[PDB]
């Protein structure tokens, strides 16, 4: 199996119910609840890894994960969660191309990888624009995107960052650019952002490492108030709205030589003339860490820049 080509151990130094670090008691219940789904005749997504999220997100209560992993995995079949991947290279040239009239509005991309050997990702928004985007695409179009991403992470992402880590790297650390978004614009998607959290949170639960926003507007306080009540605790705890010396928290987590320059740190791209919002550069683009599972497929197609 390609689990057998990566670690599938966390650090020694990692939070606690995870990989290689459990207590007597969350071992046996991890046991249990592996026991629990063979019997109901799973057989994917059984491994110590999934199962373990699942269990740290029900606080170990192997009822409430059992009944939560038993959801996912009917919304994963009605959904297409499990064939997303083929059916985008199936009709990949005409993916691609949507795909690249919305990147310079809305900068989504992946650099290089935080201290722990999390994949570092950035996401810009000040620069969306509600009617054009409502031109381009559509809001369930936008989730499946993120299911689509979810995806690409935990096959071609986590096996490579892991290899290079030496340890098993379970989510990312994410940066949120609010410079320059009005907060009017920013109650208009409230819709999108709970779609957004109710996926996040119910199909792939702990994924999420470290959440930073950043250049957020006077006032945002008030509009995330309004966020807060469908995340649960455990998501809110990974979340930081930075102040102004943003940067020097920022260097707690990320090497400097992986941040980018208007973030703090001395990253720059090979061509200086390309841009972020076309770029896809990590572990994970290193021949060196690449396994039996390939590739990742160039989501701005030819425009992808690796380097
Ligand atoms: C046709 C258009 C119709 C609708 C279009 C909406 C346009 C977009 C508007 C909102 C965009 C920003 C929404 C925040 C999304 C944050 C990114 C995210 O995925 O958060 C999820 C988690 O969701 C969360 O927990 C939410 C965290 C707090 C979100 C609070 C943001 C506040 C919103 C204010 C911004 C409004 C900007 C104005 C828009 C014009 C994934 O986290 P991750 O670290 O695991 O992600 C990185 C790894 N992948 C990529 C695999 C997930």
Redesign the pocket.
């Given at each position: 199996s390609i689990l057998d080509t990566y670690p599938q151990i966390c650090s020694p130094n990692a939070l606690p119910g995870t990989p290689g670090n459990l207590t007597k008691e969350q071992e046996e219940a991890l046991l249990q609840f592996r026991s629990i789904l063979l019997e109901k005749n799973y057989k994917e997504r059984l491994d110590d890894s999934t199962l373990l999220r699942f269990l740290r997100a029900r606080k170990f209560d192997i009822n409430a994960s059992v009944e939560m992993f038993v959801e996912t995995e009917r919304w994963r079949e009605e959904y297409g969660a499990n064939t997303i991947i083929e059916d985008y290279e199936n009709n990949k040239e005409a993916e691609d191309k949507e795909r690249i009239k919305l990147a310079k509005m809305?900068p989504?991309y992946?650099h290089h990888v935080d201290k722990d050997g999390r994949?570092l990702?950035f996401?810009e928004?000040?620069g969306?624009?509600?009617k054009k985007?409502?031109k381009?695409?559509?809001?369930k179009?936008?989730l499946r995107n993120?299911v689509k991403?979810?995806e690409?992470?935990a096959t071609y992402?986590v096996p490579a960052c892991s290899r290079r880590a030496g340890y098993l790297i379970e989510?990312?650390?994410?940066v949120?650019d609010?410079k320059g978004?009005?907060l009017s614009?920013?109650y208009?998607?409230?819709?999108?952002?709970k779609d957004?959290?109710d996926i996040?949170?119910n199909y792939?639960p702990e994924?999420?490492?470290?959440?930073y926003?950043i250049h957020?507007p006077f006032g945002?306080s008030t509009?995330?108030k309004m966020?807060k009540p469908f995340?649960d605790p455990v998501?809110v705890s990974?979340?930081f709205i930075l102040g102004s010396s943003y940067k020097k928290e920022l260097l707690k987590q990320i090497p400097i030589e992986n941040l980018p320059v208007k973030y703090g740190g001395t990253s720059v791209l090979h061509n200086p003339n390309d841009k972020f919002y076309y770029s896809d550069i990590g572990p994970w683009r290193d021949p060196r860490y690449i396994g039996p599972e390939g590739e990742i497929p160039n989501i701005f197609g030819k425009f992808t820049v690796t380097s």
């Open positions: 809305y989504q992946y994949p990702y996401e928004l000040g969306i624009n509600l985007m409502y381009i695409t559509t809001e179009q936008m993120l991403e979810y690409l992470f992402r989510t990312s650390c994410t949120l609010l978004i009005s614009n920013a208009h998607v409230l819709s999108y952002i957004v959290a996040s949170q792939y994924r999420m490492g470290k959440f926003i957020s945002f509009m995330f966020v995340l998501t990974k979340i």
